[PDB]
Each structure stands twice: as structure tokens, then as C-alpha cells.
């Protein structure tokens, strides 16, 4: 259901959005770090990007 | 899927829907590295600021990197604010 | 000699004054800056996290030791790391205290006048 | 200034990219950022590069592993970074030589000649399978280490060829 992907420039995390509502960060090869929402509802996310300070 | 390299902002990677990806020059198109994909077609793929990380990602949540084994590391950097212990 | 073990109320009661002074105001019960996409979102979340911490059977059981432990810690303003869940996989934020202090006093002052 | 790498290749090419460049010093570790900033109507050589690493010590480490070996005729030049208060930093001139010895390289040149005077740019005409072309430009930070190397031995006799001012 994964619908948007980006990195972070400062860690080994992955930043994924499924089709459930969420946005998650991921450790190396098979481990998650966080999964939060900044999303209202419906589908999760159009797109994801990295930044100097955080994740948009 | 056409994406310029981060450290090499003219050299790109070009990849199809099934995954015929090629590390390819901008200037000399003869210098192609046509890495085939012996697996299923893709949704998306991402990059390597450390230059040695293939991330193929479908809806399966199973990554694999194909490059030579320069590092035992995954991504670029190693400063996590809750690194292995909150 | 007996009044020695009674004094830890007034700071605590002012903490509850600041706490339940603005928690569920009817204009702010349903609005933009208090949803999961809203601004002051986890100030709700930790709030009842203490107050409805489920057991191994899922029963929200107090264990007021842990409650007042957390209460003095949040009252302090020190820098910690805090796991938080819905229970399920959403809105998890690992945070410290002094920014929570700052948003609390900011919201209180904004409520107090403009 | 320039406490970091700032590793400055000059005397550039029109139409050879940084591809094989990054191919060669791949296994060294610290390769931070490589870029030639450019003009707008300009697909010819202009004359400033930035093979930037993290610190200066990574540049010296890149020297100390292996440096100045011939591939594609180009040799990577070192950090200069020297602007309008440097009217004569590397422009305080050089000995210009007619009839250098025809085996004069740059590496053994500065190796034996690190004693008297520090050579900045040994702009030496070496071509066609190990032959210094007689004319060269041994270049310094001043014109004092130049006179030091001249008054020591302005060249010497190893196969007899003294060099020129």
C-alpha cells in the first residue's frame, strides 16, 4: 500500500507512506524507527522529502 | 525513473517499470552499466548519498542493495537522537 | 513535625490549575490546531497517557507512584526521551519536557489575554 | 583561510566530466563534493575546479596514498584558493628553463629539491614517454627560494645538463 518514499540525510532511516494514514521512519535493513501521522485522514501522503532539520 | 546522482549531479540512473536500471553518464552514453532486475517489477526506487545503495521498493517492504560491498553500512549518516535506547 | 509531609500540594495544585485550566474548551474541542494534524496535539496525548495507562490485560490502572514520578519530571523541565503510542502504529513522538513547558505557558498566556 | 580541503585542480578540459575522476579515487573514503562551477555560454575549458574533500588532512591523505600517476594526461592540482589580495602569491614568478634534463619529472624533482626551495608549480613540459622538453617553469611561493635553488645548484651534472633562469 506504500505510496510515497524519501530518505533522511542524517540517519539510516527510511521515510515511507503507506495507504493507511501514516508516515514512518525506518532503521537499517529490517527495522522501523517511528511511525507517526501529520496527516488528517483518508490516504496517507502525496509525497515526502528530507531537509536540513526534518521531514516534510 | 531517471535520477541524477547526488554527488555526481550529471551522472544518472535510469530504470524502467520492470527494473532495467543503468548507471549511465550524461556526456558519454556509451558508458552504460545495465544492471538487470532478476525479480518483480517495481513501484519506486531510491538513491545513495553514500553512492553504493540500491533501494528497490515495492509494496512488499523487502529491500535489497546491488553494488559491490564497500561498506557494512546502509545509508549515509549515524546521528540518531534516540539511538537504540529511549 | 506532621506538617512536614503535607507541603507537596501547592505547586502540584497550581500544576493541575495550569493543566485543567485549558484542556477541553468547547471552542477548542473541535478545531484545526488540535487534531492529529493540529498544533498542540501531544499535550493531549501524554495527558491521559498517565491517566489511562493500560495494564497487561489492557486495563487502565493508575499506580500513582508512576503518576507522580512523571508529574514531578514534567514539572521540572529536564531533557528525557519518551515512547508514546495510540496503542497502534500512529502519532509516536519521542520528546523531552522544556518545550512542553514552553507550549503550556504559551497557550496559557494566549488564553489569559491577547 | 581554507583550513578544509579546498583541493584546487586548474588547467582544465572542455568536455571531460568528473566521472572517471570519481571512478579513480573511489576507494579512498572521504570524497565530499566535486564540482566545477560555470559561466553561462561556455562549453570550453575555463580554469577552476573543486575536488573538495572534508578537511585538508583528507587532501594530504589522498596525496600520501598515491598521487600524480599518469591517466588521461591530467594530474590533480592542489589547493590554491587565492584571490585579489593574492596578486602575486603563485604569481611571484618562476625560473623559466631552456634545456632541462630530459628525465626531469615533477615528483623526484621536488623530492630531491625539497631541501633548498619549496616548488609550488613545477610547470614542466614532460611528454612522449618520459622526456622533459628542455623548457620548463619551476615555480615557487616567492622569488627567493628560486634564487636559493639557483645559487645552490641551478641544475647540476647528472648527464651534464645544468638548467636555466
Curated annotation (Swiss-Prot), chain B:
Subcellular location: Cytoplasm
WD repeats: 37-76
Domain of life: Eukaryota
Signal peptide coordinates: none
Functional description taken from the UniProt entry: Catalytic subunit of the poly(A)-nuclease (PAN) deadenylation complex, one of two cytoplasmic mRNA deadenylases involved in mRNA turnover. PAN specifically shortens poly(A) tails of RNA and the activity is stimulated by poly(A)-binding protein PAB1. PAN deadenylation is followed by rapid degradation of the shortened mRNA tails by the CCR4-NOT complex. Deadenylated mRNAs are then degraded by two alternative mechanisms, namely exosome-mediated 3'-5' exonucleolytic degradation, or deadenylation-dependent mRNA decaping by DCP1-DCP2 and subsequent 5'-3' exonucleolytic degradation by XRN1.
Oligomer status and interactors: Forms a heterotrimer with an asymmetric homodimer of the regulatory subunit PAN3 to form the poly(A)-nuclease (PAN) deadenylation complex.
Leftover remarks: Present with 1510 molecules/cell in log phase SD medium.
Domain remark in the UniProt entry: Contains a pseudo-UCH domain. This ubiquitin C-terminal hydrolase (UCH)-like or ubiquitin specific protease (USP)-like domain is predicted to be catalytically inactive because it lacks the active site catalytic triad characteristic of thiol proteases, with residues at the equivalent structural positions that are incompatible with catalysis, and it cannot bind ubiquitin. It functions as a structural scaffold for intra- and intermolecular interactions in the complex. The linker, or PAN3 interaction domain (PID), between the WD40 repeats and the pseudo-UCH domain mediates interaction with PAN3.
Recorded family membership: Belongs to the peptidase C19 family. PAN2 subfamily.
Name of this chain's protein: PAN2-PAN3 deadenylation complex catalytic subunit PAN2
Source species of the chain: Saccharomyces cerevisiae (strain ATCC 204508 / S288c) (Baker's yeast)
Recorded name of the encoding gene: PAN2
Span within the parent record: 259 to 344 of 1115
Swiss-Prot record, chain C:
Taxonomic superkingdom: Eukaryota
Region of interest: Knob domain: 22-113
Transmembrane segments: none
Post-translational note: Phosphorylated by the cyclin-CDK complex PCL1-PHO85.
Cellular compartment(s): Cytoplasm
Free-text comment about domains: The N-terminal zinc finger binds to poly(A) RNA. Contains a pseudokinase domain. The protein kinase domain is predicted to be catalytically inactive because some of the residues important for catalytic activity are substituted and it lacks the equivalent of the binding site for a peptide substrate. However, it has retained an ATP-binding site and ATP-binding is required for mRNA degradation, stimulating the activity of the PAN2 nuclease in vitro.
Subunit structure: Homodimer. Forms a heterotrimer with a catalytic subunit PAN2 to form the poly(A)-nuclease (PAN) deadenylation complex. Interacts (via PAM-2 motif) with poly(A)-binding protein PAB1 (via PABC domain), conferring substrate specificity of the enzyme complex.
Additional notes on this entry: Present with 1600 molecules/cell in log phase SD medium.
Sequence similarity: Belongs to the protein kinase superfamily. PAN3 family.
Function field: Regulatory subunit of the poly(A)-nuclease (PAN) deadenylation complex, one of two cytoplasmic mRNA deadenylases involved in mRNA turnover. PAN specifically shortens poly(A) tails of RNA and the activity is stimulated by poly(A)-binding protein PAB1. PAN deadenylation is followed by rapid degradation of the shortened mRNA tails by the CCR4-NOT complex. Deadenylated mRNAs are then degraded by two alternative mechanisms, namely exosome-mediated 3'-5' exonucleolytic degradation, or deadenylation-dependent mRNA decaping by DCP1-DCP2 and subsequent 5'-3' exonucleolytic degradation by XRN1.
Name of the protein in its database record: PAN2-PAN3 deadenylation complex subunit PAN3
Gene name of the encoded protein: PAN3
Part of the intact protein present: 567 to 679 of 679
Swiss-Prot record, chain D:
The keyword Transport appears for this protein: yes
Tree of life domain: Eukaryota
Modified residues (Omega-N-methylarginine): 74
Mutagenesis / variant outcome for changing residue 137 to V: In PAB1-6; selectively reduces poly(A) RNA binding. In PAB1-16; reduces affinity for oligo(A) about 100-fold, impairs poly(A)-dependent translation, but still interacts with eIF4G. In PAB1-15; fails to bind RNA
GO CC term (a single one): cytosol
Effect of residue 133 to Q: In PAB1-14; fails to bind poly(U), but not poly(A) RNA
Cell compartment(s), UniProt: Cytoplasm; Nucleus
GO BP annotations, alphabetical order: mRNA 3'-end processing; mRNA transport; regulation of nuclear-transcribed mRNA poly(A) tail shortening; regulation of translational initiation
Ranges of residues in domain RRM: 5-83, 93-165
Keywords: Acetylation, Cytoplasm, Isopeptide bond, Methylation, mRNA processing, mRNA transport, Nucleus, Phosphoprotein, Repeat, RNA-binding, Translation regulation, Transport, Ubl conjugation
GO molecular function: molecular condensate scaffold activity; mRNA 3'-UTR binding; mRNA binding; poly(A) binding; poly(U) RNA binding; promoter-specific chromatin binding; ribonuclease inhibitor activity
Keyword Acetylation (UniProt): yes
Domain writeup: RNA recognition motifs (RRMs) 1 and 2 bind specifically to the poly(A) tail, whereas RRMs 3 and 4 bind non-specifically to polypyrimidine RNAs and may serve to bind to a different part of the messenger or to other RNAs. RRM 2 also mediates interaction with eIF-4G.
Subunit and partners: Binds to poly(A) mRNA to form a periodic structure with a packing density of one molecule per 25 adenylate residues. Interacts with the nuclear export factor CRM1 and with the importin SXM1. Interacts with RNA15, a component of the cleavage factor IA (CFIA) complex. Interacts with translation initiation factor eIF4G (TIF4631 or TIF4632) and release factor eRF3 (SUP35). Interacts with the PAB-dependent poly(A)-nuclease (PAN) complex regulatory subunit PAN3. Interacts with ARF1, DCP1, PBP1, the Hsp70 chaperone SSA1, and TPA1. Interacts with PAT1 in an RNA-dependent manner.
Amino acid at each position: 500500500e506504500i505510496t510515497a518514499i524519501s530518505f533522511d540525510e542524517k540517519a539510516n532511516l527510511i521515510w515511507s507512506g503507506d495507504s493507511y494514514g501514516c508516515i514512518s521512519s525506518y532503521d537499517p535493513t529490517f527495522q522501523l524507527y517511528t511511525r507517526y501521522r501529520g496527516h488528517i485522514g483518508g490516504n496517507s501522503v502525496k509525497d515526502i522529502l528530507s531537509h536540513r532539520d526534518g521531514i516534510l | 525513473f531517471v535520477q541524477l546522482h547526488p554527488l555526481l549531479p550529471t551522472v544518472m540512473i535510469v530504470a524502467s517499470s520492470s527494473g532495467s536500471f543503468d548507471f549511465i553518464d550524461l556526456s558519454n552514453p556509451t558508458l552504460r552499466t545495465q544492471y538487470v532486475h532478476p525479480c518483480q517489477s517495481i513501484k519506486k526506487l531510491c538513491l545513495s548519498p553514500n553512492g553504493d545503495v540500491l533501494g528497490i521498493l515495492e509494496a512488499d517492504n523487502h529491500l535489497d542493495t546491488w553494488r559491490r560491498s564497500s561498506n557494512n553500512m546502509g545509508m549515509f549518516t549515524n546521528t540518531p537522537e534516540m539511538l537504540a535506547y529511549p | 513535625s506532621v506538617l512536614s509531609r503535607e507541603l507537596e500540594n501547592g505547586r502540584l495544585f497550581r500544576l493541575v490549575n495550569k493543566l485543567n485550566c485549558i484542556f477541553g474548551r468547547i471552542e477548542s474541542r473541535i478545531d484545526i490546531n488540535w487534531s492529529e494534524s493540529g498544533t498542540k496535539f501531544p499535550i493531549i496525548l501524554f495527558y491521559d497517557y498517565v491517566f489511562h495507562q493500560v495494564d497487561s490485560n489492557g486495563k487502565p490502572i493508575m499506580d500513582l507512584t508512576h503518576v507522580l514520578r512523571c508529574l514531578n519530571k514534567l514539572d521540572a523541565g529536564i531533557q528525557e526521551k519518551l515512547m508514546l503510542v495510540t496503542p497502534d502504529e500512529l502519532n509516536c513522538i519521542i520528546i523531552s519536557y522544556k518545550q512542553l513547558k514552553d507550549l503550556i505557558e504559551s497557550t496559557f498566556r494566549s488564553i489569559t489575554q491577547a | 583561510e581554507n583550513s578544509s580541503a579546498s583541493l584546487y585542480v586548474g588547467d582544465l578540459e572542455p568536455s571531460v566530466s568528473e566521472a572517471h575522476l570519481y571512478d579513480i579515487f573511489s576507494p579512498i573514503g572521504s570524497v565530499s563534493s566535486i564540482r566545477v562551477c560555470r559561466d553561462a555560454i561556455t562549453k570550453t575549458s575555463l580554469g577552476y575546479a573543486y575536488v573538495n574533500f572534508n578537511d585538508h588532512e583528507a587532501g594530504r591523505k589522498a596525496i600520501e596514498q598515491l598521487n600524480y600517476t599518469p591517466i588521461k594526461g591530467r594530474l590533480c592540482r592542489i589547493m590554491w584558493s587565492q584571490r585579489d589580495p593574492s596578486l602575486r602569491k603563485k604569481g611571484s614568478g618562476n625560473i623559466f628553463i631552456k634545456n632541462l634534463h630530459p628525465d626531469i619529472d615533477n615528483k623526484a624533482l621536488y623530492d630531491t629539491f625539497s631541501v633548498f626551495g619549496d616548488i609550488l608549480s613545477s610547470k614542466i613540459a614532460t611528454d612522449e614517454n618520459g622526456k622533459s622538453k628542455g623548457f620548463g617553469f619551476v615555480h615557487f611561493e616567492e622569488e627567493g627560494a628560486a634564487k636559493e635553488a639557483i645559487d645552490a645548484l641551478n641544475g647540476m651534472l647528472l648527464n651534464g645538463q645544468e638548467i636555466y633562469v
